[PDB]
From a paper:
The small substrate-binding pocket suggests that CbpD cannot bind to cellodextrin, in agreement with our titration and genetic experimental results. CbpD has been proposed to be the transporter of xylose, but we could not detect any xylose-binding ability in either ITC or NMR experiments. For CbpC and CbpD, no interaction was detected for all of the tested carbohydrate substrates in both ITC and NMR experiments, suggesting that transporters C and D are not responsible for glucose or cellodextrin transport.
Clostridium thermocellum has extensive potential in lignocellulose biorefineries as an environmentally prominent, thermophilic, cellulolytic bacterium. To gain insight into the structural mechanism of the transporter specificities, 11 crystal structures, both alone and in complex with appropriate saccharides, were solved for all 5 putative sugar-binding proteins, thus providing detailed specific interactions between the proteins and the corresponding saccharides. Combined genetic, biophysical, and structural studies have provided solid evidence that transporter A and transporter B are the major glucose and cellodextrin transporters, respectively, among the five potential sugar transporters in C. thermocellum.
Numbering used by the authors: 58 to 368
Write the structure that this text describes.
């Protein structure tokens, strides 16, 4: 990912003059994944604009190879004493990280939260990100259920056990499917955000459920794997697949018909607006406490537009 989408705000006020000429921001996010590359695009755009105004923003971009709730706490505690003006967090475990945030705030360092979900019950100054993973799950599930004519069998790739946004999307899937009583959810399995596991899960489902009619995929990786397995079995377009996020393989699968709908989030503004609001916070200025970046459903007719803008 090198650009943004049409979701990004075109009317965001950046006229405020920062009360310093230099700022240092430590970013710590749940785990390495291509998804975060789309946020980093917004960060790098804000730093450029602020460099033209004689303002130098330096930042570190840290995430572990695999998610580790304690590592995230440790990353916050250790950054406190390293001379950062603000700590930006994409959250692993809200309760554990909340307390780590409060410790950083108590010791004089403001904290921003960004990305997939907010920690509203902690002393973070502001949030920029998706305020509604449940709704994203509902959007995908409604689209797939309606495309299936409100009847048939759906299987659910459910991602990583206990991951907040995965679990909220999954709750949205099920609450929505419940509104179509002629649809049966035959199974749900945890791919753990691994493409190969999503492939193997889907392969098993194609054997076990000859009548499978739809698959819902709650993270950026599992639509890739569902589409690959469905295409390899010759079932592209005959099983209705809906998934999260913007992997180029998923967006290309929209064009070829294997994927029906992708739910793309405004990752760019998560990073772009994080920087500008961080500065207002470091300076003591007020800023919107919760900025919702938004998301939208992308079908085949919008695939090329999103591919071109993101890649």
């Amino acid at each position: 990912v090198t650009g943004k989408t049409d979701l990004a705000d075109t009317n965001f006020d950046t006229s405020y003059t920062p009360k310093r000429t230099s700022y240092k921001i430590y970013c710590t996010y749940k785990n390495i994944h291509a998804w975060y590359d789309a946020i980093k695009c917004g960060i790098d755009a804000a730093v450029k604009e602020l460099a033209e105004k004689g303002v130098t923003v330096d930042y570190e971009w840290y995430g572990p190879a695999q998610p580790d709730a304690v590592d995230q706490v440790n990353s916050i505690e250790t950054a406190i004493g390293q001379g950062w003006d603000l700590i930006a967090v994409d959250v692993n475990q809200p309760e554990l990280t909340g307390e780590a945030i409060n410790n950083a705030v108590a010791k004089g360092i403001p904290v921003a939260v960004f990305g997939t979900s907010d920690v509203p019950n902690c002393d973070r100054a502001f949030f920029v990100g998706n305020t509604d993973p449940y709704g994203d799950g509902c959007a995908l599930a409604k689209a797939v259920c309606e495309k299936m004519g409100g009847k048939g069998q759906i299987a659910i790739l459910a991602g990583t056990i206990g991951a907040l946004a995965h679990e909220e999307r999954l709750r949205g899937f099920k609450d929505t499917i419940a509104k179509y009583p002629d649809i049966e959810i035959v199974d749900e399995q945890r791919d753990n955000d691994e493409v190969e596991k999503a492939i193997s899960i889907t392969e098993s489902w194609l054997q076990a459920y000859p009548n499978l009619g739809g698959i819902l995929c709650n993270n950026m990786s599992n639509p890739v794997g569902a589409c690959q397995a469905v295409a390899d079995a010759g079932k592209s377009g005959k099983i209705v697949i809906g998934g999260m996020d913007h992997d180029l393989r998923a967006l290309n699968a929209l064009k070829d018909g294997t994927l029906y709908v992708a739910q793309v989030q405004n990752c760019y503004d998560m990073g772009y607006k994080l920087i500008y609001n961080a500065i207002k916070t470091i300076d003591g200025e007020k800023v919107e406490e919760s900025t919702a970046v938004g998301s939208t459903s992308v079908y085949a007719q919008d695939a090329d537009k999103f591919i071109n803008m993101l890649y």
